[PDB]
Design an enzyme around this catalytic site. Structure first.
Site, PDB file in Angstrom:
ATOM      1  N   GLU A  21      25.132   2.962  28.849  1.00  0.00           N
ATOM      2  CA  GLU A  21      26.210   3.776  28.311  1.00  0.00           C
ATOM      3  C   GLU A  21      25.960   4.063  26.848  1.00  0.00           C
ATOM      4  O   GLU A  21      25.138   3.411  26.209  1.00  0.00           O
ATOM      5  CB  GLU A  21      27.542   3.052  28.443  1.00  0.00           C
ATOM      6  N   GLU A  26      27.585   8.054  30.388  1.00  0.00           N
ATOM      7  CA  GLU A  26      27.285   6.962  31.329  1.00  0.00           C
ATOM      8  C   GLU A  26      25.939   7.215  31.943  1.00  0.00           C
ATOM      9  O   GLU A  26      25.535   8.383  32.115  1.00  0.00           O
ATOM     10  CB  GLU A  26      28.347   6.986  32.457  1.00  0.00           C
ATOM     11  N   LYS A  40      22.162  10.513  34.038  1.00  0.00           N
ATOM     12  CA  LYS A  40      22.934  10.526  32.783  1.00  0.00           C
ATOM     13  C   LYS A  40      23.990  11.603  32.930  1.00  0.00           C
ATOM     14  O   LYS A  40      23.687  12.756  33.224  1.00  0.00           O
ATOM     15  CB  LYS A  40      21.994  10.805  31.612  1.00  0.00           C
ATOM     16  N   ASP A 178      15.864   9.133  16.669  1.00  0.00           N
ATOM     17  CA  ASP A 178      16.853   8.110  17.073  1.00  0.00           C
ATOM     18  C   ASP A 178      16.213   7.082  17.973  1.00  0.00           C
ATOM     19  O   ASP A 178      16.799   6.701  18.983  1.00  0.00           O
ATOM     20  CB  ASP A 178      18.070   8.759  17.728  1.00  0.00           C
ATOM     21  N   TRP A 181      15.895   0.542  19.617  1.00  0.00           N
ATOM     22  CA  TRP A 181      15.271  -0.220  20.732  1.00  0.00           C
ATOM     23  C   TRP A 181      15.968  -0.122  22.070  1.00  0.00           C
ATOM     24  O   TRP A 181      15.437  -0.586  23.053  1.00  0.00           O
ATOM     25  CB  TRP A 181      14.994  -1.671  20.343  1.00  0.00           C
ATOM     26  N   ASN A 183      16.159   2.793  23.316  1.00  0.00           N
ATOM     27  CA  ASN A 183      15.542   4.030  23.779  1.00  0.00           C
ATOM     28  C   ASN A 183      14.043   3.874  24.072  1.00  0.00           C
ATOM     29  O   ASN A 183      13.337   4.870  24.246  1.00  0.00           O
ATOM     30  CB  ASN A 183      15.802   5.138  22.755  1.00  0.00           C
TER      31      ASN A 183
HETATM   32  N1  LIG Z   1      15.594   7.075  32.545  1.00  0.00           N
HETATM   33  C1  LIG Z   1      16.157   5.887  32.357  1.00  0.00           C
HETATM   34  N2  LIG Z   1      15.680   4.842  33.059  1.00  0.00           N
HETATM   35  C2  LIG Z   1      16.238   3.646  32.857  1.00  0.00           C
HETATM   36  N3  LIG Z   1      17.246   3.321  32.040  1.00  0.00           N
HETATM   37  C3  LIG Z   1      17.737   4.369  31.366  1.00  0.00           C
HETATM   38  C4  LIG Z   1      17.245   5.686  31.470  1.00  0.00           C
HETATM   39  C5  LIG Z   1      18.039   6.461  30.590  1.00  0.00           C
HETATM   40  F1  LIG Z   1      17.912   7.794  30.393  1.00  0.00           F
HETATM   41  C6  LIG Z   1      18.941   5.636  29.990  1.00  0.00           C
HETATM   42  N4  LIG Z   1      18.771   4.356  30.467  1.00  0.00           N
HETATM   43  C7  LIG Z   1      19.535   3.168  30.092  1.00  0.00           C
HETATM   44  O1  LIG Z   1      20.792   3.585  29.594  1.00  0.00           O
HETATM   45  C8  LIG Z   1      20.932   3.229  28.201  1.00  0.00           C
HETATM   46  C9  LIG Z   1      21.684   4.307  27.461  1.00  0.00           C
HETATM   47  O2  LIG Z   1      20.975   5.546  27.396  1.00  0.00           O
HETATM   48  C10 LIG Z   1      19.504   2.961  27.741  1.00  0.00           C
HETATM   49  O3  LIG Z   1      19.484   2.083  26.610  1.00  0.00           O
HETATM   50  C11 LIG Z   1      18.877   2.340  28.988  1.00  0.00           C
HETATM   51  O4  LIG Z   1      19.214   0.963  29.168  1.00  0.00           O
END
Ligand SMILES: Nc1ncnc2c1c(F)cn2[C@@H]1O[C@H](CO)[C@@H](O)[C@H]1O
Length: 327
Positions: A21, A26, A40, A178, A181, A183
């Site tokens: 999130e 979300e 996302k 941005d 960590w 990302n």
């Molecule tokens: N393509 C992806 N594969 C795995 N986890 C992901 C993603 C993504 F876009 C966000 N996230 C998670 O959602 C958080 C918020 O963007 C991140 O810090 C990650 O933990």
């Protein structure tokens, strides 16, 4: 716009689990064709505050969509090729209230991990969202704080990040802007070596069993044929007033570097973020095995030397091509 069911047919919706999130919205993980994906979901165009902030307009969310596509396409390019971003499978504009099955997933995360967000149950049936479906990139570096083997792994991670940023500088005059960590994502790979190509020259990186993916292009910038796509944060107050983590200093250091002109290309911002990530590796990450021997003690000294010298390089490209860490 389409209904949620277009993106998330029943079985796919039933398999959604919340994984992350931010103020933006979300992120859910699900499965289709036996393959994990991350979804996302960002509310747009409405008048309600969401997680304390106004919703972006379509014009405001377009840069992230465009940049996500361009960086995903680098996996299939030739002269400037990298798999170190995240794959983009699809993007949809959806209209409707939030699916009850996603609310159930949201509640489970709130109950187990806790959320900083509002429960997204207040949207009407005319609400618009952007739904981005990505490759599942693994687990973020922050969540892996205590889970990595040794500083050898950290070297591979820094090399992968630097290479990916260099390739995107070279092809797109890209700045992430941005790269905290949350990302940086890590996934197991059975590949011993990963491959990239930078201005037509191919090289390899030892994987240490991990493939890195860089995500989240909300603040990013790039250009193609003199058309610049970016987030203009020149009038943002709050972005530059954070405290308690070197992350918040990086926003101020970028603003110093660019004189508050966010359309310009300043690839030094990628160096700044790489310095912040190296700092996390040395100061906040903790490894299962310490550098208990020489040779590991040497990798540690090389990463410390990278930390104290890298700010004297002009771009990720300059780091990759000239820094002794990568020789
Ligand atoms: N393509 C992806 N594969 C795995 N986890 C992901 C993603 C993504 F876009 C966000 N996230 C998670 O959602 C958080 C918020 O963007 C991140 O810090 C990650 O933990």
């Amino acid at each position: 716009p389409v209904p949620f069911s277009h993106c998330l047919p029943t079985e796919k919706l039933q398999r959604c689990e919340k994984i992350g999130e931010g103020v933006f919205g979300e992120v859910f993980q699900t499965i289709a064709d036996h393959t994990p994906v991350a979804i996302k979901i960002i509310a747009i165009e409405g008048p309600d505050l969401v997680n304390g902030s106004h919703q972006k307009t379509f014009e405001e969310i377009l840069p992230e969509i465009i940049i996500s596509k361009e960086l995903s396409l680098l996996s299939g390019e030739v002269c400037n090729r990298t798999e170190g971003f995240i794959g983009l499978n699809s993007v949809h504009c959806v209209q409707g209230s939030y699916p009850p099955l996603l609310l159930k997933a949201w509640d489970h995360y709130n109950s187990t991990k806790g959320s900083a967000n509002d429960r997204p149950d207040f949207f009407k049936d005319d609400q618009l969202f952007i739904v981005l479906e990505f490759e599942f990139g693994g687990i973020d570096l922050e969540q892996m704080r205590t889970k990595l083997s040794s500083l050898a792994t950290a070297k591979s991670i820094l090399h992968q990040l630097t290479a990916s940023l260099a390739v995107a500088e070279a092809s797109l005059r890209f700045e992430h802007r941005d790269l905290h960590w949350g990302n940086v994502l890590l996934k197991k790979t059975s590949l011993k070596k990963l491959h990239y190509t930078l201005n037509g020259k191919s090289s390899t990186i030892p994987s240490c069993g991990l493939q890195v993916s860089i995500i989240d292009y909300t603040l990013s910038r790039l250009e193609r044929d003199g058309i610049v796509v970016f987030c203009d944060v020149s009038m943002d107050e709050d972005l530059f007033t954070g405290d308690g983590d070197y992350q918040f200093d990086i926003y101020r250091l970028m603003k110093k570097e660019n004189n508050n002109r966010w359309g310009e290309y300043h690839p030094y911002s990628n160096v700044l973020w790489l310095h912040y990530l190296t700092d996390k590796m040395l100061k906040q990450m903790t490894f299962k095995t310490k550098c208990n021997t020489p040779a590991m003690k040497q990798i540690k000294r090389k990463i410390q030397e990278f930390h104290r010298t890298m700010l004297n390089f002009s771009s990720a490209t300059d780091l990759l091509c000239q820094h002794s860490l990568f020789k």
